[PDB]
Design a protein around this ligand. Structure first.
Ligand code: MG
Lengths: 141, 141, 140
């Protein structure tokens, strides 16, 4: 997963970002058994007067966009659950701190993706489980 | 709509950005009566020697990328019209100020999107018309 | 092609960025005769404690994402070749300098794309060849 989180400048401390990125990572570890290192979260500070909503600056706004590469979600129920779980992980840092926020996901081709130069193994394969156990990309054939 | 506009550092004043984001919002309001707050425009300043076109730094270049989430464009005619209107709104700020520029759009899944933790209502629904009237996301069932 | 390259602060000098974007550009020029100016590379410096991998800051990490707009890659072999050649161009600047790195591609619709306000010509068309030779969008 590839997460971008656009925030007001200095909204989050390093400890905040660690805790939030840990919560996001736990989504994929708990629900999909993904290797932890698949989960990338990029925090991007946005100065005042750079984020515009409906033609007006919103300096109290967190905008989230992510790509899902590793898996495709095939049912309405699973797709709704992903959005629900995402909101649960985010709420302590965003909603409950008074920010406005919005989030969307795109699904991108699994075969156009490399990590440390390696082709990630098939979903739910024994090799994927090994990558998850050691939490690193291990060369294989 | 989710717009990213990468510009040279200090290309636009806060007033420029408000006027441009307003022009962008008007595309969607005028043609379909979309809720205004669906339209997000993110301005990102890029310092010199960070944007490379054909292998050479171009410090006079505005690159625009957007996601369409709320609606799909189903005919060639509508898709061409969208690009035409986009160029019209952009021209006073970009082309006419001597910038080089390029723009593209991706369409992403409508059902993997939440605003203020809420599921946006169906297109052309009474609830969508209410969201547009109040220009706020209102909880519903 | 639309490339975003996220790096640790001050990882690359202007000369580094010039050479790397030239290498990336050579992919499309050499293999498909794409117009050079189609290839855009954006470098984004990321300060310490802004890139998190598996819940921990990785301050030694280069993340690459690109969109392919102009054409689609229709076979497994071509799609694999693209990733292989990309890794080859990147290695002298990233892998060989000791960074961790990751890359992925999305394919976006050809007909929702304009450059200098113009409709790009059809792939492999006579007009595309003129755009490539002059390396600029020629009204037509
Ligand atoms: Mg896409």
């Amino acid at each position: 997963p590839y997460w971008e989180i656009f925030t007001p400048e200095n909204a989050f401390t390093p400890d905040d970002k660690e805790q939030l990125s840990e919560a996001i990572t736990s989504i994929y570890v708990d629900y999909v058994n993904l290797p932890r290192f698949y989960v990338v979260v990029l925090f991007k500070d946005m100065p005042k007067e750079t984020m515009y909503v409906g033609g007006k600056a919103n300096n109290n706004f967190v905008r989230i966009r992510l790509d899902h590469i590793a898996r495709q979600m095939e049912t309405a129920e699973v797709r709704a659950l992903m959005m629900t779980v995402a909101e649960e992980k985010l709420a302590p840092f965003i909603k409950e701190r008074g920010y406005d926020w919005e989030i969307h996901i795109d699904e991108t081709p699994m075969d156009l993706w490399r990590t440390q130069g390696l082709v990630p193994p098939p979903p739910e394969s024994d090799m994927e489980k090994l990558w998850a156990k050691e939490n690193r990309p291990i060369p294989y054939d």
